[PDB]
Design an enzyme around this catalytic site. Structure first.
Site, PDB file in Angstrom:
ATOM      1  N   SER B  55       0.804  -1.299  -0.042  1.00  0.00           N
ATOM      2  CA  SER B  55      -0.061  -0.129   0.091  1.00  0.00           C
ATOM      3  C   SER B  55       0.872   1.455   0.153  1.00  0.00           C
ATOM      4  CB  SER B  55      -1.054   0.054   1.207  1.00  0.00           C
ATOM      5  OG  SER B  55      -0.607  -0.679   2.380  1.00  0.00           O
ATOM      6  N   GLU B  84       2.190  12.058  -9.985  1.00  0.00           N
ATOM      7  CA  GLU B  84       1.113  11.640 -10.866  1.00  0.00           C
ATOM      8  C   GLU B  84      -0.224  11.345 -10.147  1.00  0.00           C
ATOM      9  OE1 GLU B  84       2.375   6.870 -11.523  1.00  0.00           O
ATOM     10  OE2 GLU B  84       4.414   7.899 -11.595  1.00  0.00           O
ATOM     11  N   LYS B  86      -3.508   9.977  -8.488  1.00  0.00           N
ATOM     12  CA  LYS B  86      -4.384   8.741  -8.122  1.00  0.00           C
ATOM     13  C   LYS B  86      -5.711   8.636  -8.479  1.00  0.00           C
ATOM     14  CE  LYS B  86      -5.152   6.639  -3.788  1.00  0.00           C
ATOM     15  NZ  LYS B  86      -4.449   5.235  -4.171  1.00  0.00           N
ATOM     16  N   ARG B 107      -7.018  -6.768  -6.604  1.00  0.00           N
ATOM     17  CA  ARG B 107      -6.025  -6.744  -5.528  1.00  0.00           C
ATOM     18  C   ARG B 107      -6.266  -8.033  -4.622  1.00  0.00           C
ATOM     19  NH1 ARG B 107      -3.350  -3.219  -3.335  1.00  0.00           N
ATOM     20  NH2 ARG B 107      -4.464  -1.414  -4.172  1.00  0.00           N
ATOM     21  N   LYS B 279      -3.714  13.127  -0.142  1.00  0.00           N
ATOM     22  CA  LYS B 279      -5.097  13.138  -0.405  1.00  0.00           C
ATOM     23  C   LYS B 279      -5.989  14.190  -0.416  1.00  0.00           C
ATOM     24  CE  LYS B 279      -6.342   8.644  -0.262  1.00  0.00           C
ATOM     25  NZ  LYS B 279      -5.318   7.870  -0.822  1.00  0.00           N
TER      26      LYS B 279
HETATM   27  C1  0XT Z   1       4.445   3.218  -5.583  1.00  0.00           C
HETATM   28  O1  0XT Z   1       3.140   2.413  -5.453  1.00  0.00           O
HETATM   29  C2  0XT Z   1       2.026   2.961  -5.878  1.00  0.00           C
HETATM   30  N1  0XT Z   1       2.115   3.917  -7.021  1.00  0.00           N
HETATM   31  C3  0XT Z   1       0.944   4.400  -7.494  1.00  0.00           C
HETATM   32  N2  0XT Z   1       0.795   5.280  -8.411  1.00  0.00           N
HETATM   33  C4  0XT Z   1      -0.222   5.928  -8.867  1.00  0.00           C
HETATM   34  N3  0XT Z   1      -0.048   6.759  -9.961  1.00  0.00           N
HETATM   35  N4  0XT Z   1      -1.535   5.471  -8.573  1.00  0.00           N
HETATM   36  C5  0XT Z   1      -1.669   4.375  -7.672  1.00  0.00           C
HETATM   37  N5  0XT Z   1      -2.833   4.069  -7.113  1.00  0.00           N
HETATM   38  C6  0XT Z   1      -0.383   4.108  -7.038  1.00  0.00           C
HETATM   39  N6  0XT Z   1      -0.386   2.950  -6.041  1.00  0.00           N
HETATM   40  C7  0XT Z   1       0.763   2.475  -5.512  1.00  0.00           C
HETATM   41  C8  0XT Z   1       0.544   1.646  -4.449  1.00  0.00           C
END
Ligand code: 0XT
Ligand code: NMN
Ligand code: 0XT
Lengths: 275, 281
Positions: B55, B84, B86, B107, B279
């Site tokens: 996570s 990036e 989410k 998952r 968030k």
């Molecule tokens: C480094 O691990 C991760 N990177 C991520 N990157 C993006 N853009 N979106 C996610 N949901 C995400 N989730 C994880 C566990």
């Protein structure tokens, strides 16, 4: 910058020589005459092939390989008769083209190699990658070139391989540009990106490199022998010279545990045609 | 046997279906019928992840973003961060073998997911095959564009089934029910963000371009930032234009760009130490 980014180019390039584009089509045409070549030390050692002259020696290689690998698949390629070279890309831009030399030190012929039209100046991703292969002259072009060597009061080239090697070892980039030299890449010299020699070849092609397409995968020396026999028959009709067929263990991990002598892989051999 | 490849590559259809219905265990991997309504399942098969998912540690303020950059600079003197989106969607892992999509998986509990491979085939943005024969596992989010969601809701209304609360319910609802034909009518999409199998390129950014070469859709909406202050501007501009994005987002993930640097920081028990998700509400 945005200027060149999009005869005009030449003018801008001679103006601010400090800033030519890697991808410039200008590198494909006559440039400088060089002082001499710099000596270059190979980041990755450029090894040699053990030779084989007979079916029995190929039998012997196969048995030596199966001392460690139970179910080897082999890939048999052509051994192109040309000059052996190494090409280093950094950030996806060709930075060093070098002769094999002694396997440790070669001559930096980077400027000359940019005028071999087949060689990519840049790649589609920002890679660091070193590839190896052979630069050569097609049989078609040899006769023409040798006419040009005479009219210039120079000795004709003894055969295509000498013509290519003597073209890339002389100092004037513009002479490279006027002969039509070409390439076949056979390998990454930097750690392999893929699982298998056959996949490396397909990958190299995805990068923009020319890969020789006459090749097979084979399970035994009987399938290999036929392919060497079909090669031996067709070879008068190929558009380049060869001097043999290279047989390699296909799978990377198999190659891994067979390893290397101080000179050559333990997982490859080069068959040589009788006279 | 041979009309197949010809028919599949030309077409890339009436006959093809017939041959496919004739000889089912020879439908070719990039057949266009994988995009159209197909089987119904009785239930999902389990699948054990080869690379388990971890996570993300979360933050909720500028201060916390600063503490992250500080913990990272205990180890790497001069970090570059990639920023990036989410995406508000459902987590998918896609395993290819020999260049063909062979599993698409949820998952689950992090080591065992649900095999939803047939449903994922109907998501047009997902490649059925790659341009080389690789073995590779890629990991991203399956979501419903806000524009599709507004259409599907109109459709459910005229058909008297109840509307989805949001694009996220709608996405999980489509992919978790058992009828591939429901997936095909609903216009789902993806953004992939990582290689789950061991990275082939040496930076997240080179990683991202690499996937795009392979045919995967990657969100263009990203930056490479050199300190928490360009990061914070990027997030503020994202928060502000958020309403104007074609999909919902759940925040910004900030990651140490280069692989050697991520490897030196490592992971806690559950999560990378080299990544944080900021968030939004
Ligand atoms: C480094 O691990 C991760 N990177 C991520 N990157 C993006 N853009 N979106 C996610 N949901 C995400 N989730 C994880 C566990
Ligand atoms: N049969 C397949 O479609 C398949 C599967 C894996 C790799 N590949 C390679 O990719 C080529 C086809 O192009 P795409 O798979 O990128 O559409 C094939 O010619 C093959 O060399 C193909
Ligand atoms: C595995 O190492 C090698 N493989 C090769 N393959 C081909 N086709 N041609 C070569 N000249 C060659 N040379 C070497 C040292």
């Amino acid at each position: 910058n945005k200027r060149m980014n999009e005869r005009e180019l030449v003018e801008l390039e001679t103006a601010y020589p400090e800033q030519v584009l890697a991808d410039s089509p200008t590198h494909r045409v006559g440039g400088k005459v060089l002082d001499g070549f710099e000596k270059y030390s190979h980041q990755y050692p450029l090894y040699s092939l053990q030779d084989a002259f007979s079916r029995e020696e190929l039998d012997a290689f196969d048995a030596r390989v199966r001392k460690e690998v139970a179910h080897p698949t082999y890939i048999c390629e052509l051994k192109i008769d040309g000059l052996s070279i190494s090409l280093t890309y950094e950030k996806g831009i060709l930075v060093a083209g070098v002769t094999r030399g002694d396997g440790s030190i070669g001559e930096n012929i980077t400027e000359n190699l940019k005028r071999v039209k087949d060689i990519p100046l840049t790649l589609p991703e920002e890679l660091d990658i070193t590839v190896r292969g052979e630069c050569y002259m097609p049989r078609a072009s040899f006769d023409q070139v040798n006419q040009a060597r005479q009219e210039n009061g120079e000795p004709e080239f003894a055969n295509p391989r000498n013509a290519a090697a003597g073209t890339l070892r002389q100092l004037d980039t513009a002479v490279v540009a006027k002969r039509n030299l070409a390439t076949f890449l056979y390998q990454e010299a930097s750690p392999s990106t893929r699982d298998s020699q056959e996949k490396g070849l397909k990958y190299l092609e995805q990068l923009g490199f020319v890969v020789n397409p006459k090749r097979i995968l084979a399970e035994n020396i009987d399938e290999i022998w036929n392919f060497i026999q079909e090669v031996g028959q067709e070879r008068e009709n190929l558009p380049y010279d060869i001097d043999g067929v290279v047989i390699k263990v296909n799978d990377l991990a198999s190659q891994e545990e067979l390893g290397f002598t101080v000179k050559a892989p333990k997982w490859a051999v080069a068959y040589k045609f009788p006279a």
